[PDB]
Design a protein around this nucleic acid. Structure first.
Ligand SMILES: [Mg+2]
Ligand SMILES: [Mg+2]
Ligand code: NA
Length: 326
DNA sequence: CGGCATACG
DNA sequence: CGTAG
DNA sequence: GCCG
């Protein structure tokens, strides 16, 4: 088992779902208390379990697995012995965890805002609605649409959304292309938003595109919320039988020179990207982001024509998107 | 022990 | 601060 | 919380 998540295939569905989930609760809780290091270890440990070829049935099968020390091993031990881990259950039940989860789920609310509201004594969505003067415009939208945004989007919904985006993009800039990214590109059948990456085959033609796309979607009556420039975090109106529902959609523009880096980043998973960037810097001495890959010795950027190029330049075996579910 | 990814709105 | 993966 |  390699130590970095970008060195091993991780499928969407696996053989250790219950164990990985328990560890992810502890990761989430660590994030709610600002402990990014502990969050990372519990996430990495969970991801190692997703990468295994069969179920963990005995404690000895953890020996030699990276990111399993005393704490993560104890969690697995208790689950294997009793079907339940007391620490995990205490977190699940806690007022702190439940409220921080509720508040951070709101579009426009992060850990820092959620924590302050918790410390002020706020516990429910209606507590927030009673004091609307304190909310940002973004948080008001997030709270108004919270119910719809809590409901997952299906792949058929995504195909409908892609068509409307493509129409707007075609008017904004003939020849521009729209690529589905995020979890749906990794093979997810459901998800809580939709991500699109937009480019144009002629370098430079994409400059100023996103405002033009947004203005056109606005005029079509499809945009329930947006900020107004290369990333737009929107709430879209999605048709349903006899009605519609609000859906989170992100639109991103990149020049075609940067497209492979943007595609890689926006395809995820989050942990996969963090691990890939960590690997790049710490093992290869190269700096990776969603725009490029920089050699700080030569002071040059690596030209990539494909994701395959990027994996090769980092000395990693290629993983297709459906194996990046770290 | 230091480090933990790296951006844009 | 929020957002993204 | 774990790794190097
Ligand atoms: Mg997504
Ligand atoms: Mg998104
Ligand atoms: Na949030």
């Amino acid at each position: 088992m390699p130590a970095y998540a970008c060195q091993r295939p991780t499928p969407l569905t696996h053989h250790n779902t219950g164990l990985s989930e328990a560890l992810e609760i502890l990761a989430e809780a660590a994030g709610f208390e600002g402990s990014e290091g502990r969050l990372l270890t519990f996430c990495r440990a969970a991801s190692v379990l997703k990468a295994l070829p069969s179920p963990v049935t005995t404690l000895s099968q953890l020996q030699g697995l990276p990111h399993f020390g005393e704490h993560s091993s104890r969690v697995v031990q208790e689950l294997l012995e009793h079907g339940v881990c007391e620490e995990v259950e205490r977190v699940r039940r806690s007022e702190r965890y439940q409220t921080m989860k509720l508040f951070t789920q709101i579009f426009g609310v992060g850990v820092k805002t959620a924590d302050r509201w918790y410390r002020e004594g706020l516990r429910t969505l209606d507590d927030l609605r009673e004091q609307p003067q304190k909310l940002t415009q973004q948080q008001k939208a997030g709270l108004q649409h919270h119910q719809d945004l809590s409901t997952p989007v299906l792949r058929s919904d995504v195909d409908a959304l892609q068509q409307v985006v493509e129409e707007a993009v075609g008017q904004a800039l003939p020849g521009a292309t729209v690529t589905l990214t995020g979890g749906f590109r990794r093979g997810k059948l459901q998800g809580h938003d939709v991500d699109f990456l937009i480019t144009h085959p002629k370098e430079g033609q994409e400059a100023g595109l996103l405002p033009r796309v947004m203005c056109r979607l606005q005029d079509q009556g499809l945009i329930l919320y947006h900020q107004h420039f290369e990333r737009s975090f929107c709430i879209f109106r999605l048709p349903q039988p006899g009605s519609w529902k609000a859906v989170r959609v992100d639109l991103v523009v990149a020049p075609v020179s940067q497209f492979p880096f943007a595609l890689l980043g926006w395809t995820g998973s989050k942990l996969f990207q963090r691990e890939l960037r960590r690997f790049s810097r710490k093992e290869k001495g190269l700096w990776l982001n969603s725009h490029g890959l920089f050699d700080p010795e030569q002071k040059t950027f690596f030209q990539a024509a494909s994701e395959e190029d990027i994996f090769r330049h980092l000395g990693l075996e290629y993983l297709p998107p459906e194996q990046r579910n770290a």
